[PDB]
Amino acid sequence: DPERRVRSTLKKVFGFDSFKTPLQESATMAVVKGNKDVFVCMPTGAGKSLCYQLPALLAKGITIVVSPLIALIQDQVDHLLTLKVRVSSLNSKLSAQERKELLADLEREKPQTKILYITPEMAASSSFQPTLNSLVSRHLLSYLVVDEAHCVSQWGHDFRPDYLRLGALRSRLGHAPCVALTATATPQVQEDVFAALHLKKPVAIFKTPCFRANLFYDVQFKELISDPYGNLKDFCLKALGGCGIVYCRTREACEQLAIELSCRGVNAKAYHAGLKASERTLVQNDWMEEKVPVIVATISFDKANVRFVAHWNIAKSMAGYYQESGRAGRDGKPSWCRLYYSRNDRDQVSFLIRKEVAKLQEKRGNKASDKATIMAFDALVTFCEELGCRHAAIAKYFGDALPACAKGCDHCQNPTAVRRRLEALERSSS
Ligand SMILES: Nc1ncnc2c1ncn2[C@@H]1O[C@H](COP(=O)(O)OP(=O)(O)O)[C@@H](O)[C@H]1O
Ligand SMILES: [Mg+2]
Ligand SMILES: [Zn+2]
């Protein structure tokens, strides 16, 4: 009865009566089985570390975990140690005796070390190769875990050439299943992970869908609104009856909107990097304690009663838009997400990204991530100019199945209304 073995370890070691979600449960059970290569794709804070930390304790041998930096490794090592777990870390920070003590333990016929954290540079080093081959030869390797697996991809936010060497390492240890985990949900990133880590097919996939049922999405065209500040004021008031957010691009527009909304009868405090750090925490504290309902911001600081998120200007990427609008309705109660779109604002953001790209190119030459940045923006322009379900467009971008939008977006609420606003936009060009 492995379910019972898992359930007892969950309580006695990790001190938990249940799994956070059933997907965390299915993922953990699939890693325990040990018959296939596993891919875990869940949001940050969804309990991905347990999906591999728990099975490692129930396996006969050692689990090797690859992670990008020592700072993040140390946090994971310090955490497991308090649970009285036999966790170790082979890195550059180790003193002469420390490394000698750890290398000796691994050379024992029955080593004490159950979980070993290493950086990719260390995994692929010729000096680590005698240790690894001995473990493979003695059938002492139970799992190979690749955390932050999106690091293999130039289509992700954190490309690391060191992660590309991990494919050849994985190929050398066939007996041991491989576990790959990330929060990045795009299909190109998933495809890069499967190919770069030389994963064995069929891969067991545990993917949290990006769909958020309680969010009402709409797109309004600033060009066709006689009183723009009046529309934002209406939207802000109607959504309440908690708190709400308004995003904009400039410090100028951030100040204009904060004063402009306070005049209409909706108390708004401007938040940007131009202000003093003393004032930053002050404005933050007041929005958190509901003294001020609206925060107009260009930058960010997690409030649970966010009833609205309004984007005064188009965001820089589809992933950025998903994350910023995603700050709404964390309590599960109904919330509203509006993106105010104009072709001039599109031309402005596009120009800004192209300069930022040329600045990186002047600094370090050409890279394949240069094209990804333009495509991440053009996917958001497509969403703004598209006629279709707002939730189905997000699902398609993140490789999810069609979501059950029960009149949960402007297009689904009334497709004719979205069509008339779009026709007026297309005609205005002539
Ligand atoms: N079954 C569980 N029940 C409750 N909390 C859990 C459970 N499993 C893990 N957690 C906790 O969830 C938090 C976030 O998990 P973590 O592994 O850091 O997530 P991720 O890698 O997805 O960002 C941690 O503080 C962890 O202890
Ligand atoms: Mg993690
Ligand atoms: Zn819809």
Numbering used by the authors: 11 to 251, 260 to 319, 324 to 452
What does the paper say about this structure?
RECQL5 (also known as RECQ5) is a member of the RecQ family of helicases, which are highly conserved throughout evolution, and function in many diverse cellular processes with the role of maintaining genome integrity. Specific roles have been established for RECQL5 in almost every cellular process involving DNA, including transcription, replication, recombination, chromosomal segregation and DNA repair. The Zn2+-binding domain consists of a pair of long antiparallel α-helices (also known as the helical hairpin), followed by series of short helices and loops, from which a cluster of cysteine residues bind in a typical Cys4 tetrahedral arrangement to a single Zn2+ ion.
